[PDB]
Amino acid sequence: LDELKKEVSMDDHKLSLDELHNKYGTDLTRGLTNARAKEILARDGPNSLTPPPTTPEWIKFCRQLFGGFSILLWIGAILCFLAYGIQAATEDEPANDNLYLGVVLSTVVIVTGCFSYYQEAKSSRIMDSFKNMVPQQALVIRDGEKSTINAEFVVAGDLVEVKGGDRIPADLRIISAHGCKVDNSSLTGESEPQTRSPEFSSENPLETRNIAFFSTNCVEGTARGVVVYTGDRTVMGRIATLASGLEVGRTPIAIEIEHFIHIITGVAVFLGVSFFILSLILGYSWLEAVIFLIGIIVANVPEGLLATVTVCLTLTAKRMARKNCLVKNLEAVETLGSTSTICSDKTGTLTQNRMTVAHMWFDNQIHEADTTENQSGAAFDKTSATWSALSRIAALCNRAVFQAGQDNVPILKRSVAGDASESALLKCIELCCGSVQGMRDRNPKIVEIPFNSTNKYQLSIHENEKSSESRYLLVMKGAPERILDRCSTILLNGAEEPLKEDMKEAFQNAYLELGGLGERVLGFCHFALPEDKYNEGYPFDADEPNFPTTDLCFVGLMAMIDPPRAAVPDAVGKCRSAGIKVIMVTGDHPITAKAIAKGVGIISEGNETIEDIAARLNIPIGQVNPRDAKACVVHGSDLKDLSTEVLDDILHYHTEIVFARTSPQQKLIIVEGCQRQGAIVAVTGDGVNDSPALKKADIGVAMGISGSDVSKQAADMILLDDNFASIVTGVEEGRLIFDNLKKSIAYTLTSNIPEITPFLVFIIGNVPLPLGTVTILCIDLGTDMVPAISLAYEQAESDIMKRQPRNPKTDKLVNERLISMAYGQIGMIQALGGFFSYFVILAENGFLPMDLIGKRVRWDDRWISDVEDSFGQQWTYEQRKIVEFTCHTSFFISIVVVQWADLIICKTRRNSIFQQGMKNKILIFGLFEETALAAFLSYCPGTDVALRMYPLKPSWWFCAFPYSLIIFLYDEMRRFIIRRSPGGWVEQETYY
Amino acid sequence: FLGRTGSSWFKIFLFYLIFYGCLAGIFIGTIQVLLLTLSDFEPKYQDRVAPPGLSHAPYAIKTEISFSISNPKSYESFVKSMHKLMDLYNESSQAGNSPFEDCSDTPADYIKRGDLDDSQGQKKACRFSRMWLKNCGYAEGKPCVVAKLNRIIGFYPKPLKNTTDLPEELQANYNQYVLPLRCAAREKIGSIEYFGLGGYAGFPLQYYPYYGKRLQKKYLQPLLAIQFTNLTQNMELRIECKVYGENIDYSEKDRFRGRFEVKIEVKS
Amino acid sequence: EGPDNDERFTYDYYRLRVVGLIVAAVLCVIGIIILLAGK
Numbered sequence A: 001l002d003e004l005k006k007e008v009s010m011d012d013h014k015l016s017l018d019e020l021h022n023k024y025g026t027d028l029t030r031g032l033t034n035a036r037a038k039e040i041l042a043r044d045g046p047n048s049l050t051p052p053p054t055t056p057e058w059i060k061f062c063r064q065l066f067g068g069f070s071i072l073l074w075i076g077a078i079l080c081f082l083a084y085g086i087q088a089a090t091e092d093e094p095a096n097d098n099l100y101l102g103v104v105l106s107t108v109v110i111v112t113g114c115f116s117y118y119q120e121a122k123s124s125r126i127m128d129s130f131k132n133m134v135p136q137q138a139l140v141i142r143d144g145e146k147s148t149i150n151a152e153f154v155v156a157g158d159l160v161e162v163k164g165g166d167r168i169p170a171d172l173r174i175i176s177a178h179g180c181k182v183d184n185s186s187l188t189g190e191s192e193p194q195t196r197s198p199e200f201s202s203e204n205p206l207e208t209r210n211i212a213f214f215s216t217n218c219v220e221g222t223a224r225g226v227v228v229y230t231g232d233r234t235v236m237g238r239i240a241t242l243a244s245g246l247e248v249g250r251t252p253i254a255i256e257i258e259h260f261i262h263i264i265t266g267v268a269v270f271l272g273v274s275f276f277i278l279s280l281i282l283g284y285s286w287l288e289a290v291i292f293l294i295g296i297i298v299a300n301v302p303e304g305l306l307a308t309v310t311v312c313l314t315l316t317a318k319r320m321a322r323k324n325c326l327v328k329n330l331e332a333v334e335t336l337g338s339t340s341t342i343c344s345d346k347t348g349t350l351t352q353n354r355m356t357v358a359h360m361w362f363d364n365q366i367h368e369a370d371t372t373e374n375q376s377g378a379a380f381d382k383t384s385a386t387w388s389a390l391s392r393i394a395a396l397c398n399r400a401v402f403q404a405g406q407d408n409v410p411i412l413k414r415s416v417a418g419d420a421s422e423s424a425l426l427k428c429i430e431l432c433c434g435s436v437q438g439m440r441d442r443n444p445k446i447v448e449i450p451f452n453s454t455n456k457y458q459l460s461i462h463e464n465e466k467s468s469e470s471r472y473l474l475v476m477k478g479a480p481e482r483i484l485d486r487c488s489t490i491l492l493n494g495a496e497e498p499l500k501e502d503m504k505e506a507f508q509n510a511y512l513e514l515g516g517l518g519e520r521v522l523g524f525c526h527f528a529l530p531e532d533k534y535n536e537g538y539p540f541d542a543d544e545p546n547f548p549t550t551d552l553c554f555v556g557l558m559a560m561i562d563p564p565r566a567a568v569p570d571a572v573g574k575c576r577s578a579g580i581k582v583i584m585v586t587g588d589h590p591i592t593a594k595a596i597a598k599g600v601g602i603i604s605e606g607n608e609t610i611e612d613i614a615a616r617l618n619i620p621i622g623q624v625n626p627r628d629a630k631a632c633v634v635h636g637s638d639l640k641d642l643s644t645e646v647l648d649d650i651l652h653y654h655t656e657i658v659f660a661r662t663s664p665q666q667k668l669i670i671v672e673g674c675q676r677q678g679a680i681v682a683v684t685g686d687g688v689n690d691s692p693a694l695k696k697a698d699i700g701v702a703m704g705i706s707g708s709d710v711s712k713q714a715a716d717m718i719l720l721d722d723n724f725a726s727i728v729t730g731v732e733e734g735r736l737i738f739d740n741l742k743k744s745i746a747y748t749l750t751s752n753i754p755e756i757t758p759f760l761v762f763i764i765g766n767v768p769l770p771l772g773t774v775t776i777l778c779i780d781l782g783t784d785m786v787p788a789i790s791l792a793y794e795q796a797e798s799d800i801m802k803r804q805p806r807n808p809k810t811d812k813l814v815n816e817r818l819i820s821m822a823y824g825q826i827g828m829i830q831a832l833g834g835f836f837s838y839f840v841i842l843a844e845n846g847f848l849p850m851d852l853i854g855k856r857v858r859w860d861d862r863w864i865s866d867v868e869d870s871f872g873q874q875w876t877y878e879q880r881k882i883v884e885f886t887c888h889t890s891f892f893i894s895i896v897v898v899q900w901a902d903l904i905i906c907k908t909r910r911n912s913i914f915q916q917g918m919k920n921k922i923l924i925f926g927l928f929e930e931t932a933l934a935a936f937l938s939y940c941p942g943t944d945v946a947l948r949m950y951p952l953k954p955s956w957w958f959c960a961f962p963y964s965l966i967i968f969l970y971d972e973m974r975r976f977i978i979r980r981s982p983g984g985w986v987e988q989e990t991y992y
Numbered sequence B: 001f002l003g004r005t006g007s008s009w010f011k012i013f014l015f016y017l018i019f020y021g022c023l024a025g026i027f028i029g030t031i032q033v034l035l036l037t038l039s040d041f042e043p044k045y046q047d048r049v050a051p052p053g054l055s056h057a058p059y060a061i062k063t064e065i066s067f068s069i070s071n072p073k074s075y076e077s078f079v080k081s082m083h084k085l086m087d088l089y090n091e092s093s094q095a096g097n098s099p100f101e102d103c104s105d106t107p108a109d110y111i112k113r114g115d116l117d118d119s120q121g122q123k124k125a126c127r128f129s130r131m132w133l134k135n136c137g138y139a140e141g142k143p144c145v146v147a148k149l150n151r152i153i154g155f156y157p158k159p160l161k162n163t164t165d166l167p168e169e170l171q172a173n174y175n176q177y178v179l180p181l182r183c184a185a186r187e188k189i190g191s192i193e194y195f196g197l198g199g200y201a202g203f204p205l206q207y208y209p210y211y212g213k214r215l216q217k218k219y220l221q222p223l224l225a226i227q228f229t230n231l232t233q234n235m236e237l238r239i240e241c242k243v244y245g246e247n248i249d250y251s252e253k254d255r256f257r258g259r260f261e262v263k264i265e266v267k268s
Numbered sequence C: 001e002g003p004d005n006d007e008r009f010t011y012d013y014y015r016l017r018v019v020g021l022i023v024a025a026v027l028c029v030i031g032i033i034i035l036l037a038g039k
């Protein structure tokens, strides 16, 4: 469906103005007829974007109500009402058991539904942001007259007019223009104004001057044009549809959840029906056969687990909110940890998005300035008298000014009225020479010649601030070579000197080096005009050369670039040390893209492209073995004629990849290419041209300050302070939460065994029921909750940023090793500790373990109010039941006591508690509150009716203590083996 | 295979065999020590049997014994359980001076055979003739229910003293040696008739305290036969038999705590 | 005692409940203290 939109567009900028009118039945001068425009409206439809059909929240909520655990809990809830119905008909049961348990279980499903619904959130308003880029109104020429109309009423063929400050209402063929410049950052991510004129200037319509696009704005001048595309058919309207239309897809974390749901659901249905038939064979009435099944359901399903996961995710997202990293989708909290490839935009993401002075060439020396936002570098020069001469030209031969009321904000961050290069120079001098306004007050400008297309220079004449002179100084800047052809002397370390071929060659060298760094280079020179030839009232003519512009003194060079953000180089290296592959994907030109790649460490030192090898060896590129080149730089124009299989080979064959001059669909294609190889991919960006890629990414991260509204709609995560170091933190947090989820899951599952085994022995042994159904829910929904959550606050056991990204195909959240430990080893020890306390309670009340076998028949018989114990005493029905429920209560408390040790062992997968310590305060809180809850549930009056919880005698609490301790020792010995031999036996069997 | 190789499948079996073996051996060990802390003659706790329960022979479907006089197999169900109990009180079961003793044919005081020790043989229990149960196949019309006080080791059932007012106000009040049992329904549409030891409507105190199964096997607890020769027919009559005493109490939950709940209906 | 051994069939479940609830409360307070050592 969207495969059409993933392709590069076709256009009609090659046609003549006249020819273009024939195609759209239009007038170049009079414009369309009121009737013809209305006709075309009904024909083509409105100049608007329609949002894609969404899935209502209704269906979204209910889709969770049927996912493995909820299905089993539904079967339980209904099977409760089943047994209740069968009762209400047969023998009038005045009880509330099956009825209430059926109500409780149905509530558990609904509430669990809210948790998973909260986790599976999708806040997407892509198409809405795009719609915000179409103006409310447009100016059209109809019947030879200009009028404002609803922009939706704009059709292909009419004559539109735009001017500085307004949004392009539709894709236009420029037919007339006067000084028109446009901001195409929507399509390129670059905000430098692009001229628009009627002349065709490139075969590529996205590069030609005679096309203006919807989603962009006119920055200055005026233009008229013929509408060629409207609504969804515009270049960026298609990007809108592509972006808004892209199928979301399941996250890595989501896939893991479903996976263990299958496992646990599997064992549940297995043991469920495996013992349902095992009971009927033993001659159990279907009346009972279902009651046992309900218990089996409740025992096997970890009722509180899915909600635990959600809370652990939420708590991890809260910590990241506190580092200026907003998470829109709870699952995106983990994806960053599983990320193996980052596709990053350059401008406004890796870079500050601001022309900044990078180097200066004066005194036959290359000086480097500090490009960082917060200025974390050092000085270059202050002493040289040459510097002050260059500094003066940079301030004086400059027409840029700071906007009013910025004195509060830092120099480099403040808004400037002017072109990017003049702003850069302004901020450079203001920083290291103080107020520039002061320099422009001490040296009043009397005449100037602003930068001309033809002159290729800008000159200014000022009253020298010096009192002993107060004469006229000439300054000029422009193209380095043009400035050179106008110089005779060079200000070396203070004093001038003739411009010999020697210094002239050093100039060329300096010029070539700076240009090689992808930096824009300017020349600077001045000339102190002779006093006798220029009186204090001498008039200077700016129109006609009234003053010399030759034999001037060359002062120096200055170079500039849109520099990396301070934290970016280090963040890139850190991603790469964690084994994450970092690719650059930018709409910017290749020379600039490549230079920043080396600056931030995308391309490491020494690595070459095929073009680099060819130039170094002075040989044809076809003569170069492409396998000798680990780095590559792909232009979008070449990308366009490559198949995906060939794109896949590029991705496979290079470690250091730069995709430059890419369109928005091309970014999507590169992302998909990476994913196709089985990689989890993150995208980082800030422009509307990142929207499709951000949507398709497993996780999209947008910049918060510099980011466009669209990009932040398309993302899963926002960096609110533009701190790229947050990606590094995000991946670290993502890995940590993945491990801690394992700990929390194992902990929760472990207590399933002591809830399952009592029901089994109840059938096979014919003893009184050791633990009840209600009692199970008091564990999974009550006591285990806070402890399970607390594992989310566990510190790393080792340097997680030192390991490679997990293999999502092999490294699962829940594997066989977890089940073996939780179900086969620790849970089994917990089961016994439960049974022990059960036998203790009964034996101390007169029913010794031996006489318990095959007694349930008489025990449950409501009409036998005289059962004989081991000592020959006789018990009524309600009397023995009180002891039985007291058994449920102590078995319950036994679970809590054995979960104490389990909580401590689940703390660490490898390390010892004596190494990791007990610095998790939430965990300790869990221990205290868990025990408080259990005690309250046993001793609070009335709980014997609502939950069948009975007061325990002090000695009862200590039954499971020896089992709780064996768990601690056992797991500590086991992990001691793991560490002592990384070989594999204990490791490959039990290492979560 | 599914998971691993044969070598791995073996090792996982050798482990869980030794592992579960140890766990079973430990579980058994903790059961040993538990038993080691307990007496053979007396249970550690008795507060959960404390107030004695009162149970009868007619096995009630739901605290009810409804049947038809004009039908044979209508009551043959209740006669099965009635027989089961009384069959134990046979004279052939009580033979010789061992381990039985002839006790007062009239309600007497308690009898202490020492302590709950094995320092003596089987503590000798009082004989009880089912022949003390006058009038009661059993009552084919108007049932002859048999009451019973639940056995509790070392329990001395203490009758109420005639200090103040009483339900069966002072009639045949053998204050010193009889634990009374008065059945009731207002709703007085019956005819209560009690049979027992010495002809009294109670339990003779000479059968106490019970020394337990280990120290007193073949022991016989006193019975109290109750006959309802009601002149009514074809209606559910809620009859409650209540025992009175210092150590006797009741509960709204446990409807058998020192009392009966019988729903007789001679639907003939 | 002899016939006056009523205490054998008695248990102070009332005190046990009072003590049990005291303990539960104090464990609840202790937990808050440790948790609130930083929020």
Ligand SMILES: *[C@@H]1O[C@H](CO)[C@@H](O[C@@H]2O[C@H](CO)[C@@H](O)[C@H](O)[C@H]2NC(C)=O)[C@H](O)[C@H]1NC(C)=O
Binding pocket: B086, B087, B088, B090, B092
């Ligand atoms: C306990 O006493 C009952 C009294 O009914 C015995 O029942 C006797 O059963 C035999 C054989 O079935 C009959 O011939 C008699 O008529 C019954 N009564 C008597 C008085 O002998 C019963 O057998 C006795 N049980 C034991 C174990 O001795």
Ligand SMILES: CC(C)CCC[C@@H](C)[C@H]1CC[C@H]2[C@@H]3CC=C4C[C@@H](O)CC[C@]4(C)[C@H]3CC[C@]12C
Binding pocket: A757, A760, A816, A817, A819, A820, A823, A824, B003, B012, B016
């Ligand atoms: C109540 C009692 C009788 C039930 C005992 C169940 C035992 C036999 C179960 C419980 C957990 C189970 C193990 C759980 C995990 C694994 C790892 C997997 O890669 C192979 C199977 C294996 C090794 C299972 C074998 C059987 C097992 C040990």
Ligand SMILES: *[C@@H]1O[C@H](CO)[C@@H](O)[C@H](O)[C@H]1NC(C)=O
Binding pocket: B134, B135, B229
């Ligand atoms: C009980 O049986 C005796 C004979 O043993 C008889 O005289 C008497 O009438 C019977 N009593 C009743 C109330 O039927």
Ligand SMILES: [K+]
Binding pocket: A694, A695, A696, A697, A698, A699, A700, A714, A715, A716
């Ligand atoms: K995404």
Ligand SMILES: [Mg+2]
Binding pocket: A189, A345, A346, A347, A348, A349, A685, A686, A687
């Ligand atoms: Mg950008």
Ligand SMILES: [Tl+]
Binding pocket: A298, A299, A300, A301, A302, A303, A752, A755, A776, A780
């Ligand atoms: Tl469970």
Ligand SMILES: [Tl+]
Binding pocket: A302, A748, A749, A750, A751, A752, A780, A784
């Ligand atoms: Tl659990």
